[PDB]
RNA sequence: GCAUCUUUAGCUCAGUUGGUAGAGCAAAUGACUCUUAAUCAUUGGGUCGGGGGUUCGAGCCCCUCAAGAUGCACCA
RNA sequence: UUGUCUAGCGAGACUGCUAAUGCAAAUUGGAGGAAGGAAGGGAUGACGUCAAAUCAUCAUGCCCCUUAUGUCUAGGGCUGCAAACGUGCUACAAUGGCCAAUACAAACAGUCGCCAGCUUGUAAAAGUGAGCAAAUCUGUAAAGUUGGUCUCAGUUCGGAUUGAGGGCUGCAAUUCGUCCUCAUGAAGUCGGAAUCACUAGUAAUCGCGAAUCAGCUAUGUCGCGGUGAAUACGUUCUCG
RNA sequence: GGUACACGAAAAACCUUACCUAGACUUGACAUCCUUGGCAAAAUUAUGGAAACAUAAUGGAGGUUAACCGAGUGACAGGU
């Protein structure tokens, strides 16, 4: 009913590690419209990562985020009762975006201390495929695999 | 601790410890703190007898925390033994100042005791 | 009860705080523009006829 | 609340009647419409009939009621029980 | 026949087991709507069937009447 | 820090040129350009529907009152309270609380006003008192940056409620003004079924100003700027 | 209902205010038309007053009545 495809704003290459994706996660953890605060929080977590993992922070972040990225997406389609789900291949842009959203969402709920250490622990906990974001990705993948039959019918 | 019947947390700084006393808040705690010259940021556990007597003396000079409860109590009785309309308004557990009582002011009325709204069969 | 209030407003009261401002064309008491001495619904009629110099419609 | 320099406030019509009424021994209730007058030390011992809006409620001032306003010791509205709507 | 119960605003019924009465409809009044219905509020309206007696005091407890209904005999 | 800035006039963007395909309007891409195909926003809202709203802005047919349903004044009331709903504010916190230093706006307003500085005061404020009828003078910008501290607790969260002492306006602050200081420290640790707004300087958020106004828990309304996102695959479902 | 509910109200202590209780007024607080004069209304100080309002005071700008200050006077004014 729209017939028009929306434009896209630039993603911007990061200002430090020159890895665009850093700016996206900065915008994701944004709250109260504070660009400054969010950068500080995030950047402090890489420094904590250095102190702990003794490795390059960008490499660790990619290894965490790339591992969290899902493959199948389940779209709800109700006909008569409940909804029979439909697994579809998500685009590359949405793949990174969904990964970042989950990373932030489970990070602001951990039992840890200041969100710097909170968010730092989640990414390091996701580089070894054992965390909270991993479980979410595992669950949707298993649900899609179970509902493989209705994948052919979408709409 | 040792200051009267109050037990100020032992692992907490003194300027917040004084607030834990009933008659001493935060601003007045700082007044005692500055007047006694005892430096803040000094954990009460790492404090000596020399400070524990001076602080007690100034606290005793100020209004006793135990007497304030009876002071407020005498004042309410003083307000009710006069027969003031404000006393009456304080009497029936209602806002004493000018606060509205139509749809709000539940902090003085406790939990809600839901009754039955009128029946509208239409007109 | 309109005419009596209009006359009383013109008359000086016995206290300074007793004096209020009422529209000078009609007798409406609330929503009176002190910048023009004209209430909101007389200012519309006057503005739409050109009686007040410079009050044009706004585009911002 | 009320400033210091200003002090207290009586309409001075209530003050004049009270001075006249205290000198006269056979005092009777004083009919005052001034709920705005603060109770002054000299008022002590007299009785007033403050206009609640409908009638004149009688208040006997004491050495304790001193300080507040004369209309504060009388009511204006009355509410004692609701009624089940349904 | 007998023993038993009932008679309570215009109608159908609670009254409490002694300090003198309400409930639900009907009627009216408003509110409410273009106006009604409905709704909603409010509301007047009693010879407690008629007399006697007890009690300081009887719708209330005991008798006699007036009008009906019950259960026990149209002799097992 | 010499060409900002302010406001008069004008130029500029016209599918004007090119490529594709269409008869033609026209669609898409490219070039140059500050701006490209309604460049963003505003004013501008057809006949009519709902006997939609207003006799309480005003005007008016008709009906009604005429020593009263008209008039003046004092006091009370519009601020009630077993309750329910709507719209907002403040929160339940370390993307934070408190303290210190400190950088960067636009718009608007102002002579019963804006009020600089100074003196007093724990403070609201008072006294003195220039300057400004205003691109001149005045109305402290806050978030933001750095440092110290709290170390996750119903707390240095949260501020309700309550008691006392003060300041301002005003005849007058009890019914029923707000501000400051002190004292206390309700609920509340992300909120059930179900719902609302929003497609870029937008949502979210931080301050500033004006209107009515002697004063006002306007947290409302109308404006101005600071920071500043995420997403749109598609019309199967949903509302119009 | 959507198209009411931080709406009329861009400011309810007095005033606003249209409501209630009281204390007061009657061609009236305000206006015209008519016979008729202007040699005032204000404001304020007294006393009684809740204040309306009364009784006494400086008797007042002005311009000879212009506007208004009135008398008389019935049509009427007035109604949120
Ligand atoms: C049968 O029922 C008899 N015993 C009754 C006779 C009654 C005569 N009066
Ligand atoms: Mg209030
Ligand atoms: Mg009118
Ligand atoms: Mg009607
Ligand atoms: Mg057009
Ligand atoms: Mg209609
Ligand atoms: Mg009043
Ligand atoms: Mg209100
Ligand atoms: Mg708002
Ligand atoms: Mg901090
Ligand atoms: Mg200069
Ligand atoms: Mg709790
Ligand atoms: Mg707090
Ligand atoms: Mg008050
Ligand atoms: Mg928590
Ligand atoms: Mg849009
Ligand atoms: Mg907010
Ligand atoms: Mg509607
Ligand atoms: Mg009033
Ligand atoms: Mg003369
Ligand atoms: Mg003459
Ligand atoms: Mg009329
Ligand atoms: Zn007007």
Residue of D nearest to B92 (CA): D80
Helix (H) or strand (E) holding D48: strand D47-51
The number of distinct structural domains making up chain A is: 1
Task: Give CA–CA dist D38/D72, Å, rounded.
Answer: 9
| Domain assignment of residue A123, yes or no | yes
Which among D65, D72, D86 is the nearest to B118, CB-wise?
Answer: D86
Q: Do B116 and D86 touch (CB under 8 A)?
A: yes
User: Which residues neighbour strand G (beta carbon < 7 Å)?
Assistant: C 1-5, 7-8, 11-15, 17-20, 27-32, 40; D 11, 13, 17, 31-34, 53-55
Domain of D49, in residue numbers: 2-85
Question: Is residue A89 assigned to a domain?
Answer: yes
Contact state of B117 with D85 under an 8 Å Cβ cutoff:
yes
Joined together, the tokens standing for residue C58 give 């706004």
Instruction: Tell me how far apart the alpha carbons of residues B99 and B89 are, in angstroms, rounded to a whole number.
Output: 11
Query: Measured between alpha carbons, how far is A62 from D54 in angstroms, rounded to an integer?
Result: 82
**Distinct helix (H) and strand (E) counts, chain B:** 5, 0
In a domain, residue A31? The reply is yes
Neighbours of chain A (3+ CB pairs under 8 A): none
How many residues does the structure list for chain B? 123
In strand F, the nucleotides that come within 7 Å of a protein beta carbon are 41-43, 57-58, 70-86, 94-96, 143-146, 149, 151-152, 155-156, 160-179, 181-186, 199-200, 203-205, 211-214, 217, 223-224, 226-238, 240
In a domain, A100, yes or no: yes
Q: Pairing state of beta strands C32-33 and C38-39?
A: antiparallel
Are the C-beta atoms of B23 and B32 separated by less than 8 Å? no
Structural domain count of chain D: 1
- Give the domain extent around A29: 20-152
Residue A11 domain-assigned (yes or no): no
Element (H, E) at B105: none
Resolution value in angstroms: 3.0
The verdict on residue A118 lying in a domain is yes
Query: Solved how?
Result: cryo-EM
DSSP A23-69: HHHHHHH--TT-HHHHHHHHHHHHHHHHHHH-S-HHHHHHHHHHHH-
List Cα–Cα distances, C20 to B74, C2, C14, C28, C44, in angstroms.
46, 15, 13, 12, 22
Q: What is the number of domains present in chain C?
A: 1
Tokens of C44: 């519309």
CB contact under 8 A, B85 and D65: no
Q: Which residue is nearest to nucleotide F178 (CA to C1')?
A: D1
Classify strands C38-39 and D30-32 as parallel, antiparallel or unpaired.
Answer: unpaired
Task: Indicate which CATH number applies to the domain containing A118.
Answer: 1.10.455.10
Per the structure, the complete domain to which residue C20 belongs is given by 1-60
Give the residue from A83, A85, A82, A99 showing the smallest Cα distance to A146: A85
């Amino acid at each position: 009913m729209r017939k028009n495809r929306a434009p896209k704003r630039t993603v911007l290459p990061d200002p430090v590690f020159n890895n665009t994706l850093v700016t996206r996660i900065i915008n994701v953890i944004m709250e109260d419209g504070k660009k400054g605060l969010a950068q500080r929080i995030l950047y402090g977590a890489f420094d904590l990562i250095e102190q702990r993992t003794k490795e390059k922070p960008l490499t660790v972040f990619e290894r965490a985020v790339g591992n969290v990225m899902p493959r199948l997406e389940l779209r709800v389609r109700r006909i008569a009762g409940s909804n029979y789900q439909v697994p579809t291949e998500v685009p590359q842009d949405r793949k990174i975006a969904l990964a970042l959203r989950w990373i932030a969402m489970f990070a602001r709920k951990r039992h840890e201390k200041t969100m710097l250490e909170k968010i730092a622990n989640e990414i390091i906990d996701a580089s070894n495929n054992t965390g909270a974001a991993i479980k979410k990705k595992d669950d949707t993948h298993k649900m899609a695999e179970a509902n493989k039959a209705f994948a052919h019918m979408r709409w | 601790a040792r200051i009267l019947g109050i037990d100020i947390p032992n692992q907490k700084r003194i300027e917040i410890a004084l607030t834990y006393i009933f008659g001493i808040g935060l601003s007045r705690s700082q007044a005692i703190l500055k007047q006694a010259n005892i430096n803040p940021d000094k954990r009460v556990k790492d404090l000596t007898e020399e400070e524990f007597v001076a602080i007690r003396n100034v606290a005793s000079a100020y209004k006793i925390e135990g007497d304030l409860r009876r002071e407020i109590a005498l004042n309410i009785k003083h307000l009710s033994e006069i027969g003031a309309w404000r006393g009456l308004r304080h009497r029936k557990n209602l806002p004493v100042r000018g606060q509205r009582t139509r749809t709000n002011a539940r902090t003085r009325k406790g939990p809600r005791k839901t009754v039955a709204n009128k029946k509208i069969e239409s007109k | 009860a309109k005419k009596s209030l209009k006359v009383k407003q013109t008359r000086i009261p016995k206290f300074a705080v007793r004096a209020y401002t009422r529209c000078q064309r009609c007798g409406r008491a609330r929503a009176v523009l002190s910048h023009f001495g004209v209430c909101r619904l007389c200012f519309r009629e006057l503005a739409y006829a050109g009686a007040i110099p410079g009050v044009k419609k706004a585009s911002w | 609340s009320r400033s210091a320099k200003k002090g207290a406030f009586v309409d001075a019509h209530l003050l004049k009647k009270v001075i006249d009424m205290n000198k006269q021994e056979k005092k009777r209730p004083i009919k005052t419409w001034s709920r705005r007058s603060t109770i002054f030390p000299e008022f002590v011992g007299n009785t007033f009939a403050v206009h609640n809006g409908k009638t004149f409620i009688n208040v006997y001032v004491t050495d304790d009621m001193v300080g507040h306003k004369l209309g504060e010791f009388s009511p204006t509205r009355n509410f004692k029980q609701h009624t089940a709507n349904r």
